[PDB]
Ligand binder design. Structure first.
Ligand SMILES: Nc1ncnc2c1ncn2[C@@H]1O[C@H](COP(=O)(O)OP(=O)(O)NP(=O)(O)O)[C@@H](O)[C@H]1O
Ligand SMILES: Nc1ncnc2c1ncn2[C@@H]1O[C@H](COP(=O)(O)OP(=O)(O)NP(=O)(O)O)[C@@H](O)[C@H]1O
Ligand SMILES: CCS(=O)(=O)Nc1ccc(CC(=O)N2CCN(c3ccc(Cl)nn3)CC2)c(F)c1
Ligand SMILES: CCS(=O)(=O)Nc1ccc(CC(=O)N2CCN(c3ccc(Cl)nn3)CC2)c(F)c1
Ligand SMILES: [Mg+2]
Ligand SMILES: [Mg+2]
Lengths: 353, 353
């Protein structure tokens, strides 16, 4: 069988696929046409159908996995289109799968004759996949990075971060919702808590407020907006800073709080609303992460999920906010393969079956 | 001068007024007409102008304060209408004032000839006012209450709570934004953190999403709605409970997360959106309160502000959520005079001037 790892989330399906590159002459013979058609279809196309995408820049080249050399590919498509994926499977096998959809769609995967579905623990998969990718490196580059001098924009820059001893680690998984994990050892990790104000809140509220019809359009709108047109700031309430409690005048006192005034609702732009939605969600995630880090006594906070893909505004807001409000005690960390760790961890469960 | 305590917030001005009821024959003579007109106007009307309200049910009767017997009155009006309040002052005095508006509008208060403005610490005022009101009781009834058996609706009921030894106490002030205070002693208290997702977020987002034009209309809409039409639940992602992490199927996994689907945005009602906004804001406040309580090692969490006025949906959601997610370790507490403690504490600063 082809070696596949799948994470079926509430919004996106993530697939990791290992393409062997050490196929012998005899191995290529014993290959069946449909397997050849699958490998060729996946490696010769970057878009699949109308909604599938291969993230080619993330590919790990010449990886040694399970005694074989190959390339590791990273592919995503909307969970809404999983019926098409399954129907293509039926028209053409151990599947290690995680995420909520591994349970919800179990019976659907079993409509593919003789398919064995192994549902794997979401937590085990995320941690194992994250530790594995960092261990193998991103084609010799660091998998993990931070934003250096996150407080000063003329200096702020992406820089590599070493995770050779990753413990302890607070993992903030920003998907549809948010899960916060504490990782103390390779064997000792737990889900601390979560928040329902996650990437699905950004996308859902932005769509209601602006009519945007994609994540990417929502980000494009937010990049042009001014969130202070919708938010009420400390200086709007006090006239300036509130130094008694260390609150700068620019801090948001009430998200969307200026929208209680009808004349302000009538003048705000869609772009302003999109940016306020992004700022509201991102700041709340940062604050929840900081509170959990203080309670777990962990100072490294790594953010994963796909809320942060092609989203440098939110990444830089997290980096600045965690450093500023922690007085420099906490560091925001990011990972190049942030959306795919569950899918990789699922793939890594293959030998136990 | 008349004895007044004012808390000028980002949204509402709260005024506490002590009406003496032990006026002697000679004292009534030495009273000037404008003071008589002020007292009569305040005590013979329940609405003031178009936006001022006296909360008559909160009145403390026959209180002894500063060596005099009187009634303590509680009055509120929008900060947007503070110009009218000041203009009525000029057309007719030590003013102890707190809140951000005591700083922002300092010069405006000083347009009233010879008026002395004493800006008082918001934290000192909230704590002193809260401790004072609980100490004097609510006309012999408890000032503080909780919801007994908050998990079972056929049993859940408001019940009194004793605060004779109030320390330690976590105070969650839900105004435009949210401030979280830790009160360890009458002299030892601090602002722990805050969140900008507060009552102004509820009101602002609800107005944008539904067109409601008052707090009360927003609550009326929310009472008729179904938040699960907009929110994505754990059972929507997993097909059921996620017992591995203790998440019931009914828990919200992504607030507004079903609004990423255009057909669902086209079918959701305004009432559904209002309820989802209330649930989103209230749950996030509860979760932040729980995290702070765990970090401060405090198990009594008292909620104040005016986000909870005439808002039993949010109060019962906080009571159920704090008890459920803390496995019964934390108790949600509420106070009858929750919006007015800053104004009372300001009034109590009068002797130091
Ligand atoms: N192409 C996209 N389509 C939709 N959302 C996207 C897309 N790209 C990035 N996102 C963002 O990424 C979030 C989902 O990230 P993801 O990590 O895949 O979560 P999920 O696994 O599908 N949901 P969950 O079950 O809670 O883990 C969305 O809510 C968006 O904010
Ligand atoms: N009549 C009302 N008008 C507006 N908002 C109301 C009203 N009644 C209750 N509220 C709610 O109460 C919240 C404000 O409560 P409040 O405690 O008075 O805060 P504030 O002091 O004005 N703002 P802040 O400066 O952050 O403390 C509003 O955001 C509403 O959600
Ligand atoms: C990974 C499983 S998921 O895929 O279904 N995603 C997912 C993401 C976030 C959540 C939210 C989550 O963790 N809550 C637990 C903590 N809460 C509260 C609420 C009030 C209080 Cl007072 N205290 N605590 C809120 C809910 C969730 F339930 C599922
Ligand atoms: C009482 C003064 S007010 O009247 O102006 N109201 C008021 C209410 C809430 C707030 C918000 C507040 O406290 N923040 C401090 C903590 N934050 C974060 C953000 C990201 C991270 Cl990573 N960590 N922490 C957010 C802001 C405020 F600034 C003022
Ligand atoms: Mg996920
Ligand atoms: Mg206030």
């Amino acid at each position: 069988s082809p070696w596949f790892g799948m994470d079926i989330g509430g919004t996106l399906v993530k697939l990791s696929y290992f393409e062997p590159i050490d196929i012998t002459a005899e191995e290529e013979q014993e290959e069946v046409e449909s397997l050849k058609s699958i490998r060729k279809y996946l490696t010769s196309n970057v878009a699949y159908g109308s909604t599938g995408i291969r993230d080619v820049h993330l590919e790990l080249k010449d990886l040694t996995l399970f005694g074989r050399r190959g390339n590791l590919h990273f592919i995503r498509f909307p969970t809404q289109d999983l019926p098409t994926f399954i129907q293509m499977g039926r028209d053409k096998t151990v599947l290690c799968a995680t995420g909520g959809g591994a349970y919800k769609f179990e019976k659907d995967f079993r409509t593919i004759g003789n398919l064995h579905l192994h549902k794997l623990d979401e937590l085990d998969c995320l941690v194992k996949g994250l530790l594995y990718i960092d261990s193998v490196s991103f084609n010799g580059q660091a998998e993990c990075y931070y934003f250096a001098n996150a407080s000063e924009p003329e200096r702020c820059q992406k820089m590599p971060f070493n995770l050779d001893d990753p413990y302890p680690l607070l993992v903030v998984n920003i998907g549809s919702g948010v899960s916060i994990l504490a990782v103390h050892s390779k064997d000792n990790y737990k889900r601390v808590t979560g928040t329902s104000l996650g990437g699905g809140t950004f996308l859902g509220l932005c769509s209601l407020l602006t009519g945007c019809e994609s994540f990417e359009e929502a980000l494009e709108m937010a990049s042009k907006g001014d969130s202070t047109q919708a938010d009420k700031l400390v200086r709007d309430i006090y006239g300036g800073d509130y130094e008694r409690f260390g609150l700068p005048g620019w801090a948001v006192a009430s998200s969307f709080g200026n929208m209680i005034y009808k004349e302000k609702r009538e003048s705000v732009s869609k772009e302003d609303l999109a940016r306020a939605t992004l700022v509201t969600i991102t700041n709340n995630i940062g604050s929840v992460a900081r509170m959990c880090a203080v309670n777990e006594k962990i100072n490294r906070v790594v953010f994963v999920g796909n809320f942060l893909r092609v989203n440098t505004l939110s990444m830089k807001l997290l980096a600045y906010a965690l450093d500023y409000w922690s007085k420099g005690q906490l560091k925001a960390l990011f990972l190049e393969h942030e959306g795919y760790f569950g899918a990789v961890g699922a793939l890594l469960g293959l030998p136990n079956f």
